[PDB]
Amino acid sequence: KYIRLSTLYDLMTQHWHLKTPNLVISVTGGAKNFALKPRMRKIFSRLIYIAQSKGAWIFTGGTHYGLMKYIGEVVRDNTISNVVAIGIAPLYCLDNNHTHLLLTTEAKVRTQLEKYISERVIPESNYGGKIPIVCFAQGGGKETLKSINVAIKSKIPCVVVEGSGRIADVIASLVEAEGTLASSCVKESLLRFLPRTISRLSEEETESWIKWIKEVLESPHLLTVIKIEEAGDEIVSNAISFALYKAFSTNEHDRDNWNGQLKLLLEWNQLDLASDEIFTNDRNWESADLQDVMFTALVKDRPKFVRLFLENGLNLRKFLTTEVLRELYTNNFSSLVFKNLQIAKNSYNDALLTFVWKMVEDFRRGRHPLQALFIWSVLQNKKELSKVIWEQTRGCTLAALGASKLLKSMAKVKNDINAAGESEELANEYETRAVELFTECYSNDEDLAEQLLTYSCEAWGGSNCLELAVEARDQQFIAQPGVQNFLSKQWYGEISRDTKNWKIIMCLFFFPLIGCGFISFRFLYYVSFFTSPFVVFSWNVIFYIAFLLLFAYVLLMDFQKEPTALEIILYVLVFVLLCDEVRQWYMNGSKYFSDLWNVMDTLAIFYFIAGIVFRLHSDESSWYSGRVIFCLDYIVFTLRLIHIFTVSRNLGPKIIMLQRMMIDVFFFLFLFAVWMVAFGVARQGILRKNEHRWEWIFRSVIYEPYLAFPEWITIPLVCIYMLSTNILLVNLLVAMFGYTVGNNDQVWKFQRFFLVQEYCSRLTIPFPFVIFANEILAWEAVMKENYLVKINTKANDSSEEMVHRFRQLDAKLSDLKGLLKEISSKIK
Amino acid sequence: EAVMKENYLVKINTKANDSSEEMVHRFRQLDAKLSDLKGLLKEISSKIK
Amino acid sequence: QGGGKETLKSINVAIKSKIPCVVVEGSGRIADVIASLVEAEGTLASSCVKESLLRFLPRTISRLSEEETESWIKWIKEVLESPHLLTVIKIEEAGDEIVS
Amino acid sequence: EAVMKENYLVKINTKANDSSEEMVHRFRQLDAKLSDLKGLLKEISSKIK
Numbered sequence A: 001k002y003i004r005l006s007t008l009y010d011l012m013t014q015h016w017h018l019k020t021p022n023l024v025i026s027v028t029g030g031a032k033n034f035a036l037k038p039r040m041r042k043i044f045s046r047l048i049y050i051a052q053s054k055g056a057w058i059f060t061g062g063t064h065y066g067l068m069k070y071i072g073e074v075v076r077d078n079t080i081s082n083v084v085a086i087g088i089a090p091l092y093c094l095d096n097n098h099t100h101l102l103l104t105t106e107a108k109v110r111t112q113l114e115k116y117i118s119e120r121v122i123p124e125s126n127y128g129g130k131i132p133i134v135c136f137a138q139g140g141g142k143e144t145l146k147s148i149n150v151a152i153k154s155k156i157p158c159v160v161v162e163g164s165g166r167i168a169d170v171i172a173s174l175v176e177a178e179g180t181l182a183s184s185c186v187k188e189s190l191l192r193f194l195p196r197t198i199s200r201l202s203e204e205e206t207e208s209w210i211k212w213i214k215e216v217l218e219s220p221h222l223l224t225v226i227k228i229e230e231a232g233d234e235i236v237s238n239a240i241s242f243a244l245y246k247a248f249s250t251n252e253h254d255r256d257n258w259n260g261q262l263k264l265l266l267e268w269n270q271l272d273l274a275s276d277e278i279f280t281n282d283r284n285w286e287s288a289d290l291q292d293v294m295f296t297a298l299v300k301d302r303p304k305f306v307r308l309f310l311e312n313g314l315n316l317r318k319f320l321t322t323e324v325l326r327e328l329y330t331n332n333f334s335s336l337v338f339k340n341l342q343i344a345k346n347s348y349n350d351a352l353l354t355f356v357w358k359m360v361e362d363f364r365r366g367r368h369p370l371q372a373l374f375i376w377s378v379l380q381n382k383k384e385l386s387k388v389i390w391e392q393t394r395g396c397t398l399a400a401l402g403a404s405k406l407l408k409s410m411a412k413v414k415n416d417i418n419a420a421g422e423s424e425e426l427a428n429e430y431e432t433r434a435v436e437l438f439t440e441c442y443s444n445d446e447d448l449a450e451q452l453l454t455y456s457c458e459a460w461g462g463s464n465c466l467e468l469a470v471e472a473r474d475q476q477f478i479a480q481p482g483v484q485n486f487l488s489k490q491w492y493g494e495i496s497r498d499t500k501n502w503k504i505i506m507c508l509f510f511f512p513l514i515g516c517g518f519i520s521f522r523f524l525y526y527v528s529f530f531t532s533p534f535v536v537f538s539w540n541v542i543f544y545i546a547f548l549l550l551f552a553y554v555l556l557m558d559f560q561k562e563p564t565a566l567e568i569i570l571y572v573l574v575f576v577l578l579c580d581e582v583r584q585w586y587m588n589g590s591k592y593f594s595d596l597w598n599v600m601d602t603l604a605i606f607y608f609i610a611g612i613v614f615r616l617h618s619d620e621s622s623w624y625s626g627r628v629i630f631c632l633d634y635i636v637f638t639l640r641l642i643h644i645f646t647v648s649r650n651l652g653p654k655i656i657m658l659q660r661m662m663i664d665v666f667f668f669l670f671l672f673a674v675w676m677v678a679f680g681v682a683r684q685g686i687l688r689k690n691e692h693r694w695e696w697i698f699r700s701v702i703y704e705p706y707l708a709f710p711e712w713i714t715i716p717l718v719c720i721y722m723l724s725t726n727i728l729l730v731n732l733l734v735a736m737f738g739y740t741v742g743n744n745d746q747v748w749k750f751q752r753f754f755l756v757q758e759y760c761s762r763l764t765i766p767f768p769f770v771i772f773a774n775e776i777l778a779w780e781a782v783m784k785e786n787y788l789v790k791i792n793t794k795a796n797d798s799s800e801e802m803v804h805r806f807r808q809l810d811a812k813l814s815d816l817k818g819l820l821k822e823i824s825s826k827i828k
Numbered sequence B, D: 001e002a003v004m005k006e007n008y009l010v011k012i013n014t015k016a017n018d019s020s021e022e023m024v025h026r027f028r029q030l031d032a033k034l035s036d037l038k039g040l041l042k043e044i045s046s047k048i049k
Numbered sequence C: 001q002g003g004g005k006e007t008l009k010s011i012n013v014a015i016k017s018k019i020p021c022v023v024v025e026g027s028g029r030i031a032d033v034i035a036s037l038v039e040a041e042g043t044l045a046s047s048c049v050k051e052s053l054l055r056f057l058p059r060t061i062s063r064l065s066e067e068e069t070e071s072w073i074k075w076i077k078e079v080l081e082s083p084h085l086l087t088v089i090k091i092e093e094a095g096d097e098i099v100s
């Protein structure tokens, strides 16, 4: 949009586009030669994204050269994600990337434009109104120094310089000094950095450059320098906001209006500036009007200011009212994560997620409120902000684990794998946040720690800290030596673990040996003995062994025609071994039958009742058919006993090698039985009874290989006998090393934990008797307060980077020249 | 993709942190400030005689 | 650790009457004044007090009468008479066991 | 074995190399030499007036 020039604001901000909540000015002029360094393009591309986040205008020289060409390429590429680049200008080629072009006699409406903008009060009023202006200067020469004085002296826009240029490095080096307003220190410099420029024209304009700099350094509170040693991220935001704050602070009317300077420093991210110049206690504030600033410090994603307002005094359990919490979930809860929650609730349903999905619903519909703000910041992956709200929670061994479940149950939703990936790495540093918070709680009194593991929590998720870890599969928390000691103290029960291993077993046989000092547990010690799950599991093996020796005895000597007294006890003991399975039919959820060995125990009893049905029929055809499906069930009641010994010896590091291998041979024998059906058909289809068919053939083809003309066809038959023995032997050896593929220390201790806690979830009564059946938290606050001090003590290896140890040398080196130039002045 | 490209080309030349953590230029800027002393301290004695 | 009127009063009435020790740290308004005023000699700080004390706390001095602001010179010149009763907890004691 | 013992007890207290490679005392001896300046440079201005 060309406009020839020789007020402007009305036809271009009402008929064309929006307002301008920021306005950056890059003063370069038509310098065709410009070294866009990889640092100089870092400044003027972070600036475009900052201006995109604020919706600014960029006034620059509208020509197709230098930085002004590089600027226009970034505004072209960033109108797809609201910067408007207004350009003001042999003949220079025009930059074909400025959406509104404003073509000596033209750098006077540029000054007339910005002063009309800088005066223009707007009732949004975050910078006291008055539309913040920055003037970025980086070049050298005539028009650069002119554009600083006509900026600074007429009205007040800030100027920002960097350490790369001809005259920008002059003013970058002329701020750590005093030179009587630099009436003779200008020519001391300005030929060291630009010697060719001074010998071009008249001295009366070179004399004027002294005046052009003495009007600049009158106000050094409007000139921020971007040094070279700001060699990190966020250096343009640390320079604009540091410049904009100076022009705000020196209005001499915001001493009462300190609240304007806080929302300015909150619109940007200036923690170190706000903590030193606003929250420094020589100013009078009350810390009760901080509440509308805190509500914007959350929803505008300021995780560093929410820590600042809390450490400056803010009762968060009194700030978090219910209308404040519903302004978060209804307005400031992002719809993408909320639609991610519905898919998280349906396909992976859990008691925790039903509590959270109820919580987001009735907060979007209509107490422990601090445990609801922590949910708000952990759902949307506020990674630095949820670490701050976690530090205020009443019980933090719990809430670090429960948030680790809320992330990991949403880290499996594959709608956005990045958000499901950031939730996975955030939950790992809540596992790690809850490991060391527990080992510090376990390096102290261990009985005091284990009461916290089984706390009722007043229904945070309704679960304890230990049960929240096993459902979330937090392998780092459960494999620590604190919890694995607690299980071994639980599985041995009230018996001490220092007796021996065999010393308990020599007391199961002989009941008078418990009453002696032969067991060293901790009046009627037998109830403590026969309720610890070591002796419960030790009873249900020697009873199960003695079950089989009277199942074998009734199958050889007895079992003539009458179900005698030895079989009636064999009837009811199977029913005793059945009446716990109807309680194993409880707490199953149709997935505890998905281990392929609880079902073989349940199909064992269902194969036994058919032997009872076949028994009391008095005919010899079903009596012998009742003996045979008793004898085949004798194998299954041994394969349960063998599977007991298989697990209970290799319960340890070999529990991940086993039961991954067990499915791998379950797959291999399935591929064997598929091949035996194939080899049966190729045997039935060759030998006789060729067409002699009934439903005989549907049952003979299976069992017939188990009991067991060449014109050119015998040579592929052995090639089949090479191809068939390959693909079965390969599956045999793949089953041999399926455990190998796939932090190996933590993964077996959790699998060791999950099996014993499945057996600790059993009733802790022996087998024949199954038919018969808030000031402790004041101690964890000290362990909590020592830990929160410890995680902010951790800046040792950050401070071993001696860039502040070199900076305190620089303060002591600045102590020299500030105090040594005064030594020479008292001599003359 | 040009913005993702331009953020990346800035990033690969931003990477001089562990090169600049070698403080041989942080010692060199001390040497410039130490050269600021002797260039400006020998002139203190000359105005006394 | 603090700043203001009653903090500087509670040091002089400590030190001058009998001898309890005082311990300051590098975080505060007037505590950082006395933290920075131990590596120096200023003729008992009769004119070096106002060289500081507005750099660290500028709003505090423009509140009341000069005759009590003149007294703050006396309130500090009685403090730095005995620098053997005033230990400073510096920021660069960034480890364990710094209070002991 | 007392000589092999005495060389070893010296050796385990010799081991403060990687502790002393943390140059916080090498910066502290600069601070003593920087405190040597201001203790001896304010007296230069007082003999001129």
Ligand SMILES: CC(C)CCC[C@@H](C)[C@H]1CC[C@H]2[C@@H]3CC=C4C[C@@H](OC(=O)CCC(=O)O)CC[C@]4(C)[C@H]3CC[C@]12C
Pocket (backbone or CB within 6 Å): A487, A488, A491, A501, A505, A538, A541, A542, A545, A648, A649, A651, A756
């Ligand atoms: C004389 C005949 C007829 C009876 C033989 C008795 C055994 C069948 C019993 C008595 C001793 C028992 C064992 C005693 C000690 C334990 C250790 C235990 O290993 C664990 O540490 C469990 C994991 C844990 O929670 O720490 C597993 C079961 C086991 C082998 C018991 C399994 C069955 C055993 C061998």
Ligand code: NA
Pocket (backbone or CB within 6 Å): A724, A725
């Ligand atoms: Na075969």
